[PDB]
Amino acid sequence: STGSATTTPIDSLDDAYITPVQIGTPAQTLNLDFDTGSSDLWVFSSETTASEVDGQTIYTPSKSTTAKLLSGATWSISYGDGSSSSGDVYTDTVSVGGLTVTGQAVESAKKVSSSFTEDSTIDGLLGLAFSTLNTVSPTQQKTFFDNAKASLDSPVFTADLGYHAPGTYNFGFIDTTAYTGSITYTAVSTKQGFWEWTSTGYAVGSGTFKSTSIDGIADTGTTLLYLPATVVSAYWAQVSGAKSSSSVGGYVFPCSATLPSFTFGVGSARIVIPGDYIDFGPISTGSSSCFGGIQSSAGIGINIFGDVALKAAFVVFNGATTPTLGFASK
């Protein structure tokens, strides 16, 4: 089997992407944030504290003839950005782009933190990291991909995120029309539960490539590119007036600037992030100070190849017995 679904930016900045997901019988379609950096599929629901729901579409398990309470199971998750959610668990039928999993754990939120409430466009998350990170207790549950894998034509999914435009998540096949040149594959460590890999270096603008190993995670659920302070300083030094602002929480730059590109290495191959992808707009409405899309990972404890990086590539998440990651230009 295969599946193919369009993923759409939630706003004009590509702060996140939402993908429609069918849950239950009859189908209830919710728009979920597909997150290769976590492993829980959780939704706003009829059980979510009412004051914490503001515009989201909810899953109502009592209206699904295939929903079953997973007795005794609870979940609770906290994300890198400080947000969180928790609740109980149902199993139900879940379909993405024509690909159906029966008995998928659907984690129903009883509580969500303010940032989730405040974002009316995201109805929940669909985790695509390794199932070892799933938070369900006392019986850990499998991700949608893990459940689907054996049925797929090939044990892979691909992320093709758009810049200020829709893109695609495919399951079970590689669309050879969706990228240019060849796909370069690189080793993955699953030891921390992430799609963790090692970039071979970087360049800033038209500058020379610096060969240096940068360990990090391919994370579709993180907006920005978080790299070591040395790398980030070298990037922003090429932008007149750019500075790190403790009050804002990262590098800012004059909105009048033209940003240089940023290149990262995948083996001997190179992925170029155009400068415009690195502009996250005014820090506050009407400001001429703009927020940068490349930020320091210092104090996160890990480097993160988030959407800023991934959207410059066609990315293969290869879930074969030994997982690997592939990157192509597009």
From Swiss-Prot:
Its EC number is 3.4.23.22. Disulfide bonds join C255-C290. It comes from the Eukaryota. The active site is at D35, S199. This is Endothiapepsin. Keywords: Aspartyl protease, Disulfide bond, Hydrolase, Protease, Signal, Zymogen. Residues 17-328 form the Peptidase A1 domain. One of its GO terms (biological process) is proteolysis. It comes from Cryphonectria parasitica (Chestnut blight fungus). It is an enzyme of class 3 (hydrolase). One of its GO terms (molecular function) is aspartic-type endopeptidase activity. Belongs to the peptidase A1 family. The chain holds residues 90 to 419 of 419 of the full protein. It catalyses: Hydrolysis of proteins with specificity similar to that of pepsin A, prefers hydrophobic residues at P1 and P1', but does not cleave 14-Ala-|-Leu-15 in the B chain of insulin or Z-Glu-Tyr. Clots milk.
